[PDB]
Amino acid sequence: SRITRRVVSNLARRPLTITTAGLAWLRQYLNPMGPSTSSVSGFPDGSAVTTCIADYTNTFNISFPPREAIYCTGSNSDEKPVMLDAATYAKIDAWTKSDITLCILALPMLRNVVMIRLYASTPTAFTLSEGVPNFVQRFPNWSAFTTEGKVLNNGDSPGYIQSFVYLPNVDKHLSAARGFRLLSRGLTGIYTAPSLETQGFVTACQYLAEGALQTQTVGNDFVQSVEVNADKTVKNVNGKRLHYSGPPKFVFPLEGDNCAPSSLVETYHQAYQARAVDGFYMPILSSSRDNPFISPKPQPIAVFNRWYYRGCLDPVPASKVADGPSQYYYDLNVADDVAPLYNTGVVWMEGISSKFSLKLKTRTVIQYIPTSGSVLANFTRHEPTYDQVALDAADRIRNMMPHAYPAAYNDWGWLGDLLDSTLSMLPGIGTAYRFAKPLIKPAWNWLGGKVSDFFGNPVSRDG
Amino acid sequence: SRITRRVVSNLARRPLTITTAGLAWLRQYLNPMGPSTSSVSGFPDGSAVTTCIADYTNTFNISFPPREAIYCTGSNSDEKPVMLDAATYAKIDAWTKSDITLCILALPMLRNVVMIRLYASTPTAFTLSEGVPNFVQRFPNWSAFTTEGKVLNNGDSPGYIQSFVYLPNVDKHLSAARGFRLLSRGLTGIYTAPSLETQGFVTACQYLAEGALQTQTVGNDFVQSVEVNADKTVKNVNGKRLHYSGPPKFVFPLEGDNCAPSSLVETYHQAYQARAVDGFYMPILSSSRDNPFISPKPQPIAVFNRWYYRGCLDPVPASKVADGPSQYYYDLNVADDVAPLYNTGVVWMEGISSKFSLKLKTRTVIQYIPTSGSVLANFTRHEPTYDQVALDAADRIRNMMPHAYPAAYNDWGWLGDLLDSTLSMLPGIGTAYRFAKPLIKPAWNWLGGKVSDFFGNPVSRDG
Amino acid sequence: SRITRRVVSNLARRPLTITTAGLAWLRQYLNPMGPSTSSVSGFPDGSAVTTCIADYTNTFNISFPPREAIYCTGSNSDEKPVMLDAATYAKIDAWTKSDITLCILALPMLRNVVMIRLYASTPTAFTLSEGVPNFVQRFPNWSAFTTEGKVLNNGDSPGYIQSFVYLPNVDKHLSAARGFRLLSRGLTGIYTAPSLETQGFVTACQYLAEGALQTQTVGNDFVQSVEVNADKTVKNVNGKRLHYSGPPKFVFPLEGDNCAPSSLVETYHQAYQARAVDGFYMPILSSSRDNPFISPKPQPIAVFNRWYYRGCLDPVPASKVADGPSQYYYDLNVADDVAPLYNTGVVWMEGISSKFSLKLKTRTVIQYIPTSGSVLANFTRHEPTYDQVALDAADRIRNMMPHAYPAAYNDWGWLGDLLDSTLSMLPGIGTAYRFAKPLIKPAWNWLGGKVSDFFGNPVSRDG
């Protein structure tokens, strides 16, 4: 479409607009895994500090794991991880006859980029275990769970298996940086199954789940003061119930009943959905205007679900105010330098073939402030830039972008001018005199039929 | 004043300005209980998510409660609320001979919209009980307290009674929503007393009291490790003093000595004051630019007052650093999904007649993100809008608006053009070419005499 | 340079720009200790509330303290501070033969403005004591420490001495104000040593260290429930290990290994460095756009350093998740109404003569909201102003300003027009038509050689 702006470039001019660096950052942020892999650029805020920008590209081959890749998470595996017993693994192998459901939940955690789950059938809700599990395994090692969300011992009935995805280089770099900020993140799953078995539906959506450091009320009723005279007068023990704060932890609000595929596809406008063979490609979008540096702060991660006891909502006695609304936090038994303000993503793939293979790539771009004497200090860069109209454009476009795209759609045609279209009535400029394009309502029918982009031009998808 | 903008509309034009939706939201936000009751509109941020907007209008008839509406809050009422004894109620009835003082404190709590208090005479400070009270009653049930801020048993001397105002529909809806945000809130009290008894002075003011989730240091000195040999050697008990964190709670900073009517009317410019018969109407204004969604998070509410022990401010030994500045948090014995960033309001009415009647209405507009399967899902709406110049105008006008108005003044004449006047030198537009009005310093003498609005036009108040 | 804007004032005009009040605030904020001492102005946000602005100017004569000014911090000084023994003080006096290192760390604390340290030689890292020290002294009283970061008893080997700098008037005023906000802060050290002994290098830098209220996980293993029958059956004691939250405290993230002079001068662009005799002058810059009021909230201050135990990062058993990453918070044994969003400053002076004298002045400007009945109420002021283009300029200029200046450089020539230069392409105005100056890259070679300002004009430094 070169002739378009070849011929319309002589009708209007351009006031103060984005620089090339803010443009480069915005195109590595909206489309992290497109053509922007050639170069990386930092957050345009003029930090005026020595920073080093590191990108991590990782690939994994998710498949139905063999027996040796599974691990019990119950009591029988508390000093070391334990193989899944052959008798127990027979129940897992029973899932091979039918189809399965793959769940990929990407919290804004850096070391553990995503969390993978395999259900025999689509679950009603995204459950969790009450008790903290034992030795949460990382890919390619999995960790089974019971039919309901409880830890599993050998011989119990398994309902789903789980495995995080750990990036060791991110850990090594984060151990040696004063601060960091997640510049961009992108997931991409290319699904492929043996030919003539192509069933399955993929639905992907991202939403802000702003966790924070909180503590859980705990009551234990421990003894307080006992008096003795060398074992002759132990009459008073003075034990009493005490409510205190458990160890602090970073809690993520994500509600169990609402992570089902139907709830997400029906609640969120931009929740992408398509046939499984189309794959998926999710760029994770931030949820805030700014992006301050965070010093590396690792603490255990927990997830909040709906409370159980009404407690203080109704009038209650004085003694039981401490209990209040009994709200329970589930452990993930992992710790990470969580970076909030980024949307939590979630992808469901139901009906996929049992012996599928999901070829998953991930690109994560992080900006560090190195500690001198570390390796990060040898790759530093000191031409920081400031361009806040790019930040305003990022604030603009976050709502209008769809939540995911087909895997093959890693190439766009409407970046360099869509920013101009925003510039047109960007309120920062009273009249930008922009001739790029008038905005058109898009209709992305990714499942089938015609697909309309932001400007009504059909996409050339075929094979 | 139609002819004004009939004749001045031909001298200048208008650049990018507010839409109709941002206008509708701003007029339901500045004046929640005016003519904007016809329709409701959401926060203009382009959330692009399924939301449902619910408005709650409630009316209550505050009066001097009879005997059966009072309840002891001390130890004698710890398994169930207890009637106020007739002997104790005689002291309360003694307040009937003279005038009284009504205090209405509206924290940014959603379920418990306001908290009501009745003093025999204007208190020096807004006190609270040290110990958490028993069965904090809701309207129309009250809960007495001693002369000073201590819980009351039958036979003690009462100083003031208290009753929250609970909205059950808000509780039902909040139990079934992923997130929420308080769009607007407005209180209105129409005072009326028997004719020829019209004395009383009302002073109303709102101010940001930004509470947060904090914990209180608690020391208990509980035993740690005792060794025995079947009751022959209990020589060591090893008890020691330990300082830990109490259960987490949402603390509101509002200082006791500074809630007196004189302090508020003398400290705050816009603190409205008038004769009691004029009634009052307080729109609660937000204190922040944005308004993010909050997942329903109920925790007990506490209030902070001035600390007592200097502690670590002066040089202190190592062992007593944990105590530090002894700062005590008072319970309200209530839990609510508190929504910060909204100003805490407070209204005092001193000298009002004993058998007055305060007809109080409240309008609260909240935007939910429904959980599918709940009732909220059946009333949803998916035309979200974005208009950030309206948000900039809201940021502009917050300082200039007065804190309250007379009850009868629910109709304005300067909304549609005051926003234009802001637009004139809104820095977003270099030259807006606006002809609405030049800003004029207002002087609101609501107690008596002439009252000047934002443009010098007198208000037509008479009877 | 009057002729410059005498002759270039006839070529262009000026749209909406800063007022005189926003200008006055910005010049008391960027250069707190320049000519702006004539008058003080508040934060330009239109708070519309009674405020009183108080400035504190303090002077101190830091020198090598005599014996009576030192105090042990170990166990032998836990009921009262103890003189440093003559035998122990001999080791300190041994530092007189050689040069020394002075460290000045200014956290955004109000009562304790700075913290002073004296090392016999430049330390590898800015360490701290594991155990909380006893009676942290204030100037002119110091408090010794061991060679490594441990508290010192008489007879131990001393490594460095420490003394805070306490402002009592700030404490008195903060005890009687509803809220406050640090308008500006500036340090200035004029070093002077006997003539012919002028060696030493000063390096100064400031950086945001955003502390917050957090708690530390503590495990103690205290007994829970023991049953007896008057000392005949004590068979079960039921003690167990419990992890809870320690007392809440305000934690500052500042990493020990990275406060060395080389790390700061090599990591930060604007980290000022010069010969010691040149002195230093650090204006502390805020790190945020806004500056909300904070109610006086004193709590103990702690500092975070790199964690030790990996903990939950690798797969771990269920029982030991509570421990997680063992991260230890160091006490400073002080409490203050910390005001975050202000950069933590730090100045190192190595090689300075043993019997030097550092004449240190400090100017701190704070805006209070008085509590009526306090002294602050008698000096109040009610002409608040709003000028947000000044705030945008403050946001602009924060990155470009150097972190410190020579002590004698308390006079500038590029304030009134540099703001205009920002105005030129301030995106708020599409075309500001400003003729002040085109921006030029500065090169501050304060150690020696020519120094280039923001416009290339050399500074007239001589003697």
Numbering used by the authors:
A (entry chain B), B (entry chain C), C (entry chain A): 96 to 558
Q: What does the paper behind this entry write?
A:
The RNA genome sizes of LSV1 and LSV2 are ~5.6 kb, encoding three major genes: the Orf1 with the unclear function, RdRP responsible for viral RNA replication, and the capsid protein (CP) for the host recognition and viral capsid assembly. CP forms the capsid shell that protects genomes and is responsible for both host specificity and receptor binding to transport the viral genome into infected host cells, or for intracellular trafficking. We determine cryo-EM structures of T = 4 and T = 3 capsids of virus-like particles (VLPs) of Lake Sinai virus (LSV) 2 and delta-N48 LSV1, belonging to tetraviruses, at resolutions of 2.3–2.6 Å in various pH environments. Analyses of these capsid structures reveal the intermolecular interactions that drive subunits assembly into homo-trimeric capsomeres and eventually into a complete viral capsid in which specific domains, such as the N-terminal domain, the helical domain, and the β-barrel domain/C-arm, could encapsidate nucleic acids.
To investigate the positions of sequence variations in the context of the VLP, we truncated the extra N-terminal 48 residues of LSV1 CP, namely delta-N48 LSV1 CP, which self-assembled in vitro into delta-N48 LSV1 VLP, for cryo-EM structural analysis to inspect the structural differences at the regions of low sequence homology. We reconstructed the density maps of the T = 4 and T = 3 delta-N48 LSV1 VLPs at 4.8 and 3.5 Å resolution, respectively, by gold-standard (0.143) FSC. We could only determine the structure of the T = 3 delta-N48 LSV1 VLP because the densities of several large side chains were apparent and the rotamers could be properly modeled. The cryo-EM structure of the T = 3 delta-N48 LSV1 VLP comprises residues 96−558 of subunits A, B, and C, in which residues 49–95 of NTD with N-ARM and the last residues 559–565 of CTD are disordered. The helical domain of T = 3 delta-N48 LSV1 CP comprises a three-helix fold as found in LSV2 CP, but is equipped with an additional N-terminal distal helix (α1’, residues 96–104) that associates with the core (α1, α11, and α12) of the helical domain. Delta-N48 LSV1 CP interacts with ssRNA via the rigid helix α1’, α1’–α1 loop, β-barrel domain, and C-arm. In addition, the focused refinement reconstruction in T = 3 delta-N48 LSV1 VLP further shows a visualization of the RNA coordination, in which a two-based single-strand RNA (ssRNA) was partially resolved. K545 and R556 are two basic residues on the C-arm, but only the side chain of R556 faces the ssRNA-binding site, as does that of R370. This ssRNA-binding site is formed by the dynamic C-arm and the βF–βG loop of the central β-barrel domain.
